[PDB]
Design a protein around this ligand. Structure first.
Ligand SMILES: *[C@@H]1O[C@H](CO[C@@H]2O[C@@H](C)[C@@H](O)[C@@H](O)[C@@H]2O)[C@@H](O[C@@H]2O[C@H](CO)[C@@H](O[C@@H]3O[C@H](CO[C@H]4O[C@H](CO)[C@@H](O)[C@H](O)[C@@H]4O[C@@H]4O[C@H](CO)[C@@H](O[C@@H]5O[C@H](CO)[C@H](O)[C@H](O)[C@H]5O)[C@H](O)[C@H]4NC(C)=O)[C@@H](O)[C@H](O[C@H]4O[C@H](CO)[C@@H](O[C@@H]5O[C@H](CO)[C@@H](O[C@@H]6O[C@H](CO)[C@H](O)[C@H](O)[C@H]6O)[C@H](O)[C@H]5NC(C)=O)[C@H](O)[C@@H]4O[C@@H]4O[C@H](CO)[C@@H](O)[C@H](O)[C@H]4NC(C)=O)[C@@H]3O)[C@H](O)[C@H]2NC(C)=O)[C@H](O)[C@H]1NC(C)=O
Ligand SMILES: *[C@@H]1O[C@H](CO)[C@@H](O[C@@H]2O[C@H](CO)[C@@H](O[C@@H]3O[C@H](CO[C@H]4O[C@H](CO[C@H]5O[C@H](CO)[C@@H](O)[C@H](O)[C@@H]5O[C@H]5O[C@H](CO)[C@@H](O)[C@H](O)[C@@H]5O)[C@@H](O)[C@H](O[C@H]5O[C@H](CO)[C@@H](O)[C@H](O)[C@@H]5O)[C@@H]4O)[C@@H](O)[C@H](O[C@H]4O[C@H](CO)[C@@H](O)[C@H](O)[C@@H]4O[C@H]4O[C@H](CO)[C@@H](O)[C@H](O)[C@@H]4O[C@H]4O[C@H](CO)[C@@H](O)[C@H](O)[C@@H]4O)[C@@H]3O)[C@H](O)[C@H]2NC(C)=O)[C@H](O)[C@H]1NC(C)=O
Ligand SMILES: *[C@@H]1O[C@H](CO)[C@@H](O[C@@H]2O[C@H](CO)[C@@H](O[C@@H]3O[C@H](CO[C@H]4O[C@H](CO)[C@@H](O)[C@H](O[C@H]5O[C@H](CO)[C@@H](O)[C@H](O)[C@@H]5O)[C@@H]4O)[C@@H](O)[C@H](O[C@H]4O[C@H](CO)[C@@H](O)[C@H](O)[C@@H]4O[C@H]4O[C@H](CO)[C@@H](O)[C@H](O)[C@@H]4O)[C@@H]3O)[C@H](O)[C@H]2NC(C)=O)[C@H](O)[C@H]1NC(C)=O
Ligand SMILES: *[C@@H]1O[C@H](CO)[C@@H](O[C@@H]2O[C@H](CO)[C@@H](O[C@@H]3O[C@H](CO[C@H]4O[C@H](CO)[C@@H](O)[C@H](O)[C@@H]4O)[C@@H](O)[C@H](O[C@H]4O[C@H](CO)[C@@H](O)[C@H](O)[C@@H]4O)[C@@H]3O)[C@H](O)[C@H]2NC(C)=O)[C@H](O)[C@H]1NC(C)=O
Ligand SMILES: *[C@@H]1O[C@H](CO)[C@@H](O[C@@H]2O[C@H](CO)[C@@H](O[C@@H]3O[C@H](CO[C@H]4O[C@H](CO)[C@@H](O)[C@H](O)[C@@H]4O)[C@@H](O)[C@H](O[C@H]4O[C@H](CO)[C@@H](O)[C@H](O)[C@@H]4O)[C@@H]3O)[C@H](O)[C@H]2NC(C)=O)[C@H](O)[C@H]1NC(C)=O
Ligand SMILES: *[C@@H]1O[C@H](CO)[C@@H](O[C@@H]2O[C@H](CO)[C@@H](O[C@@H]3O[C@H](CO[C@H]4O[C@H](CO)[C@@H](O)[C@H](O)[C@@H]4O)[C@@H](O)[C@H](O[C@H]4O[C@H](CO)[C@@H](O)[C@H](O)[C@@H]4O)[C@@H]3O)[C@H](O)[C@H]2NC(C)=O)[C@H](O)[C@H]1NC(C)=O
Ligand SMILES: *[C@@H]1O[C@H](CO)[C@@H](O[C@@H]2O[C@H](CO)[C@@H](O[C@@H]3O[C@H](CO[C@H]4O[C@H](CO)[C@@H](O)[C@H](O)[C@@H]4O)[C@@H](O)[C@H](O[C@H]4O[C@H](CO)[C@@H](O)[C@H](O)[C@@H]4O)[C@@H]3O)[C@H](O)[C@H]2NC(C)=O)[C@H](O)[C@H]1NC(C)=O
Ligand SMILES: *[C@@H]1O[C@H](CO)[C@@H](O[C@@H]2O[C@H](CO)[C@@H](O)[C@H](O)[C@H]2NC(C)=O)[C@H](O)[C@H]1NC(C)=O
Ligand SMILES: *[C@@H]1O[C@H](CO)[C@@H](O[C@@H]2O[C@H](CO)[C@@H](O)[C@H](O)[C@H]2NC(C)=O)[C@H](O)[C@H]1NC(C)=O
Lengths: 313, 230, 211, 84
């Protein structure tokens, strides 16, 4: 049970809770009155000031990621043993399905960074000539549509908060990294995108879509219809913290047949159940100082709509 | 040439409405924000409240909502009233203007900034005294100079409360004016003195009228000073 | 209030009362007693017009630096109350200016006190009262003990002395008063106001028998 | 936390501490007032008589070697596979 108070700001409202609580020490009998800070997505209140508890505690056990291991992606080349080999389809405009004109063999794929991200794809492979649009089936709106860019889209993501990290002794050998104070101004995480190149890429795509729908037609963009936070917003790990950014401003557009930058409000979570596997959750420790990272946006995952009006848009 | 001038009542009984007005000069009332400030004897400075262009007043919560502020666009007269006064409220009151600074650190779309106020132009600072003791007007006598640059003046005796202003020839004699601190008698009655310097050849030819004003008692005295009959 | 004192011509520096939390907008002000207050610093470093550049503040370089004024070339006219109005992104609305650092600049030359005495006017003596006033001016420092003498003997009865207070010339002034009646006024040969300044004395004496 | 007393000797000084302490049982609620002896190198005092604690407890988790396994050395012949 967590005694949480809202965070010290001059009104204009918390997301972040200054939660005192009793802990244990390396001594089995002596206990430890401590406090930490948590984002609201990690805690849930439990019904004087309001007491709280971690959102996982009631479903899934929780472990604190080792602070030494890094979540940073690394290019991985998958390889084939003797008697087997890998085939690299090389033709430029290639919809991933059907035969391939130019076929070459390698024993190993290229460097592949396992980027774990939802909605937006980052740091990935670009397409050749036109931007290729691949979906196992488009008639099936339910089949997700995967997009490959010819040009990367820059994005600048920060956690603009200089972060203290307290290490708490629950041992022997067991140590919990809490959050001390933010140092100075409290700002919320965000990402920026050149509104220009962004809207430029929306059009380069929409001209690639009418190739599959009408010579003259209308195309509209909307934010996610619903789901978990991982789907409704853009999940990604920036600098060790796990970000979730409101993309409603990216998908709020309409297209007919014929200088500044956007900014995306982001949310950070620490208790993580990624891959949704109940029973087991990971608590990511906090990252010290202000976080910043920058990525080439290189692809997309999108869903269509339904019968509705026939051919209007 | 924006100027500020107060108008104090000079004395109010405890638990009575304390009215003060600060006359606005040199511009209009709608370009900036307005504020009032006080200082109690022996204590520090104290911020009271402010009011903006759209006239919504905003007070310091430490006042228990006993304060009200009003402007007057036509009069260009900024008003001020204080009900339920206490003797501890005796102080010296100013008026000033508020520039709304906006300190921006992070992103504006998220409002990562704040509003601050700096005080540029100022009032003169009239004096008021919350007291339940009956008012006391000043007693005026013309101090006669010496017959041997000499000295002459006027006496202000047993007035309650402060302030009392002394002017020579209705504001015509400036150089030489030295007014001195008003003593606190054991009777709780003030006694001050004002003095101005002149050459030795102007006695009898020049007429010196000290002009005394005790506004609490509405006491305005145009007293004349003459040399001794010897 | 927080005491402080710097000599003449030196470089002065005043730390703020509270401490910064988030980015800041620091306001410094100066209060001469009886006068109106004066703004010196807004926006950490921005100086308004007409303010001496002897006075420099602390710009916002993202924290570290504490809010502080810098007065190069301290003068005698630098004696007043000092308030640091702090504003930041966290602590909130600042209704208070923090503590008062009352600066006292010393090292000034000594001035001979200007002492002068007055007799009871004819208009006041006609009112069955008598009073003697003694005004001291143009002296540094303001350490004076005002004394009266009946002929050659001291008098403590009805002695009202005002505390020496600075004038506009950075020199103290005080007024002394003596409650009396017209009969005790005309009863003694001569009365004297004694103003001893730094062991030296500037005394003035009046007599009812002399024009 | 360990209530340790020096060991019973006729002066001429301990290295060894007769430490009482509360323990747990197989029953999750019932607890166990017990005592043991320890060499001083295993305990460290922690600031009435002095209380103590194991020197590791603050850095490293601790496990009790199985009493069945022996630490005795045994001749080992390292060997090479075919081709080496
Ligand atoms: C959430 O979170 C949060 C946060 O935290 C933070 O962050 C984090 C992250 C980390 O980092 C941490 O660390 C931090 O903290 C939390 O909260 C909170 O916070 C805060 C901040 O700050 C904090 O506080 C702090 O603390 C410290 C400590 O202190 C203490 O101790 C000491 C020793 O060491 C001492 O000295 C003191 O005093 C204190 O206390 C004390 O104690 C004792 C013992 O216990 C007591 O006694 C008692 O008594 C009674 C009767 O009365 C009985 O007898 C009994 O028995 C006994 O015992 C006493 O009393 C006490 N005292 C008092 C007074 O009370 C420290 O260090 C610090 O402080 C410092 O600093 C500051 C400055 O900065 C100063 O001053 C201050 O100031 C301010 C302003 O500025 C003020 O405020 C004010 O107040 C008033 C009233 O009074 C009003 O209200 C107004 O309006 C306001 O403004 C204040 O008060 C003050 N303070 C005082 C204390 O006074 C101070 O003082 C200091 O300094 C110094 O001082 C001196 C005087 O004294 C001077 O002279 C000098 O000069 C100076 N120096 C300098 C350099 O400055 C601070 O305070 C806290 O702690 C925290 N808490 C905790 C728990 O932790 C929270 O909690 C969370 N939450 C949750 C839920 O979780
Ligand atoms: C994603 O995208 C996001 C959206 O774009 C983006 O968010 C942005 O984040 C950044 C931070 O990373 C934010 O940047 C801050 O912005 C502030 C605003 O800066 C502008 O304005 C100031 C001041 O302008 C005032 O004054 C002039 C003069 O009167 C007026 O013309 C102005 O209108 C305004 O005046 C107001 O008040 C007047 C009353 O007096 C009114 O008359 C008037 O109408 C106004 O209301 C300018 O100085 C700035 O110029 C700078 O930038 C331009 C180009 O933009 C350059 O050409 C130029 O050289 C300058 O660099 C600008 O126009 C800044 O306050 C802020 O910088 C201060 O804060 C930070 C944080 O604490 C400090 O580190 C820094 O030192 C600064 O503090 C100094 O400056 C301020 C302001 O003067 C002072 O208050 C402070 O005391 C201190 O000043 C002292 O030291 C200085 C040197 O250290 C010196 O300059 C001073 O003179 C003094 O000595 C900072 O830059 C930004 O707001 C966010 N939003 C946007 C929309 O951009 C996000 O980062 C992106 N993320 C990623 C990953 O991409
Ligand atoms: C899409 O791709 C882009 C580009 O590929 C990614 O952008 C990356 O963003 C991450 C954050 O998400 C950045 O990582 C952090 O960057 C820090 C900067 O390091 C540089 O500066 C320091 C000091 O000048 C140098 O020493 C560094 O040199 C190191 O790397 C070079 C190779 O570039 C090697 O040659 C050197 O030998 C060094 O190894 C860099 O030039 C960096 O501090 C930080 O690493 C610390 O933090 C992690 C945990 O957060 C620790 O595990 C690690 O040990 C480091 O800790 C040290 O430093 C910190 C201070 O930062 C201290 O607190 C510690 O005490 C300790 O000393 C981390 O690497 C990265 O810079 C940036 N660029 C690249 C090319 O990766 C996007 O993220 C990616 N997007 C997604 C979604 O994956
Ligand atoms: C970490 O864990 C500890 C222990 O669980 C928590 O602290 C205890 O909190 C309880 C709940 O409030 C406290 O109980 C209160 O005790 C008072 C009597 O205490 C006396 O005796 C104790 C020793 O037993 C002394 O330490 C103490 O000085 C007193 O002399 C009562 O006054 C309280 O009941 C009355 O007051 C409350 C309002 O305060 C009313 O709501 C009640 O109806 C009633 O009128 C109350 O029962 C207890 O004293 C605390 N301390 C202990 C046991 O040492 C921490 O809060 C917890 N921290 C976390 C979770 O962050
Ligand atoms: C998603 O993937 C599916 C296949 O997995 C593709 O769906 C095909 O879409 C077309 C058009 O909707 C369908 O083709 C039409 O089917 C008629 C009869 O279907 C029977 O016969 C076919 C064998 O051809 C069997 O596979 C099927 O099970 C049925 O038993 C034919 O009569 C049609 O031919 C005539 O009509 C069309 C217009 O009506 C003309 O264009 C033709 O030239 C011709 O005159 C026609 O072939 C097809 O059945 C669907 N296949 C399946 C297996 O369901 C989607 O196209 C794909 N989505 C995208 C975006 O690629
Ligand atoms: C992802 O991104 C989308 C789009 O950015 C967000 O949607 C926004 O949601 C908020 C929250 O409701 C909406 O904010 C509303 O805006 C009004 C603006 O107030 C002033 O502003 C305009 C002009 O600046 C003036 O005309 C207006 O009169 C005001 O002066 C407020 O009126 C609203 O708050 C008030 O009304 C509600 C009742 O509706 C009351 O309950 C409140 O207490 C309060 O009085 C309100 O804040 C905003 O409009 C939405 N925009 C869009 C495009 O939908 C999503 O929130 C975001 N999602 C995530 C998960 O981040
Ligand atoms: C294993 O764990 C137990 C429990 O933690 C420890 O035994 C307890 O030790 C504490 C600390 O001394 C004892 O507390 C003392 O209690 C007295 C009052 O006790 C009355 O009530 C209890 C029930 O609550 C009855 O059992 C008992 O008979 C009494 O009627 C007080 O007298 C004590 O305080 C006063 O005396 C001491 C000196 O003895 C002074 O220092 C104090 O300032 C004060 O004047 C004291 O608080 C407690 O009684 C013990 N027994 C329990 C809880 O059952 C073991 O020591 C521990 N063994 C280990 C670690 O090896
Ligand atoms: C992807 O493109 C390939 C060709 O690159 C298409 O393959 C055709 O598939 C049909 C079966 O529906 C075969 O009969 C044709 O012979 C294939 N054509 C060629 C040129 O090989 C395939 O339909 C495309 N799929 C999508 C989803 O776009
Ligand atoms: C994201 O940040 C990068 C670098 O942090 C920006 O690229 C730099 O932009 C500055 C101007 O802000 C230029 O002077 C540099 O030459 C650029 N460098 C490189 C390597 O491109 C980029 O513009 C930022 N993007 C957004 C959308 O804010």
């Amino acid at each position: 049970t967590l005694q949480c108070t809202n965070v010290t700001n001059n009104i204009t409202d918390g997301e972040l809770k200054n939660c005192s609580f009793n802990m244990t020490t390396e001594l089995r009998d002596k206990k430890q009155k401590v406090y930490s800070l948590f984002y609201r997505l990690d805690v849930v209140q439990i019904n004087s000031n309001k007491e709280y508890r971690l959102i996982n505690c009631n479903t899934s056990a929780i472990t604190q990621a080792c602070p030494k291991v890094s979540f940073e992606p690394i290019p991985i080349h998958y390889c084939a043993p003797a008697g087997f080999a890998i085939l690299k389809c090389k033709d430029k405009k290639f919809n991933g399905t059907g035969p391939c004109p130019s076929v070459s063999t390698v024993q190993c794929t290229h460097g592949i960074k396992p980027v774990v991200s939802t909605q937006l794809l980052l740091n990935g492979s670009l397409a050749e000539e036109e931007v290729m649009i691949r979906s196992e089936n488009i008639t099936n709106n339910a089949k997700n549509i995967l997009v490959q860019f010819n040009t990367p889209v820059q994005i600048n993501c920060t956690r603009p908060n200089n972060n203290t990290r307290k290490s708490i002794r629950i041992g022997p050998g067991q140590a919990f990294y809490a959050t001390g104070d933010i140092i100075g101004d409290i700002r919320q995480a965000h990402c920026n995108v050149s509104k220009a190149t962004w809207n430029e890429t929306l059009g380069k795509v929409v001209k690639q879509l009418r190739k599959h729908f009408g010579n003259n037609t209308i195309i509209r963009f909307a934010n996610s219809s619903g789901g978990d936070l991982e789907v409704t917003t853009h999940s990604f790990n920036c600098g060790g913290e796990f970000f979730y950014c409101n993309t409603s401003g990216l998908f709020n557009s309409t297209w007919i047949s014929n200088n500044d930058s956007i900014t995306l409000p982001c949310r950070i979570k620490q208790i993580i159940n990624m891959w949704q596997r109940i029973g087991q959750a990971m608590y990511a420790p906090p990252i010290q100082g202000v976080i910043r990272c920058v990525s080439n946006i290189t692809g997309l995952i999108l869903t269509r709509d339904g019968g509705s009006t026939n051919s209007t848009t | 040439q924006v100027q500020l001038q107060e108008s104090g009542p000079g004395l109010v009984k405890p638990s009575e409405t304390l009215s003060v007005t600060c006359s606005v000069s040199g511009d209009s009332m709608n370009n900036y924000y307005w504020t009032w400030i006080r200082q109690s004897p022996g204590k520090g400075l104290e911020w009271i409240g402010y009011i903006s262009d759209r006239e919504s007043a905003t007070y310091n919560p430490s006042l228990n909502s006993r304060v009200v502020i009003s402007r007057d666009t036509s009069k260009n007269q900024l008003s001020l009233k204080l009900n339920s006064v206490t003797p501890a409220d005796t102080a010296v009151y100013y008026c000033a203007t508020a520039r709304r600074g906006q300190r921006i650190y992070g992103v504006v779309s998220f409002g990562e900034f704040f509003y601050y106020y700096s005080m540029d132009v100022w009032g003169k600072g009239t004096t008021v005294t919350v007291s339940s003791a009956s008012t006391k007007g000043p007693s005026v006598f013309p101090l006669a100079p010496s017959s041997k640059t000499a000295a002459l003046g006027c006496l202000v005796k047993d007035y309650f409360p402060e302030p009392v202003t002394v002017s020579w020839n209705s504001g015509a004699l400036t150089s030489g004016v030295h007014t001195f601190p008003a003593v606190l008698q054991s009777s709780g009655l003030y006694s001050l003195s004002s003095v101005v310097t002149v050459p030795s050849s102007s006695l009898g030819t020049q007429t010196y009228i000290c002009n005394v004003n005790h506004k609490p008692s509405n006491t305005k005295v145009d007293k004349r000073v003459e040399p001794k009959s010897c | 209030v927080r005491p402080l004192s710097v000599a003449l011509g030196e470089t002065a520096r005043i730390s703020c009362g509270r401490q910064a939390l988030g980015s800041r907008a620091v306001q410094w002000y100066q209060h001469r007693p009886g006068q109106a207050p004066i703004l010196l610093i807004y926006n950490n470093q921005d100086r308004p017009s007409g303010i001496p550049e002897r006075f420099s503040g602390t710009p916002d370089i993202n924290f570290g630096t504490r809010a502080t004024l810098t007065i190069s070339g301290v003068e005698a006219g630098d004696e007043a109350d000092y308030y640091c109005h702090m504003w930041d992104s966290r602590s909130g609305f600042s209704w208070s200016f923090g503590g008062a650092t009352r600066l006292t600049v010393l090292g000034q030359p000594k001035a001979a006190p200007s002492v002068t005495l007055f007799p009871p006017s004819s208009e006041e003596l006609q009112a069955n009262k008598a009073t003697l006033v003694c005004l001291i001016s143009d002296f540094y420092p303001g350490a004076v003990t005002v004394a009266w003498k009946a002929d050659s003997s001291p008098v403590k009865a009805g002695v009202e002395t005002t505390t020496p207070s600075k004038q506009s010339n950075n020199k103290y002034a005080a007024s002394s008063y003596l409650s009396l009646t017209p009969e005790q006024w005309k009863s003694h040969r001569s009365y004297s106001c004694q103003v001893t300044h730094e062991g030296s004395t500037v005394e003035k004496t009046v007599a009812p028998t002399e024009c």
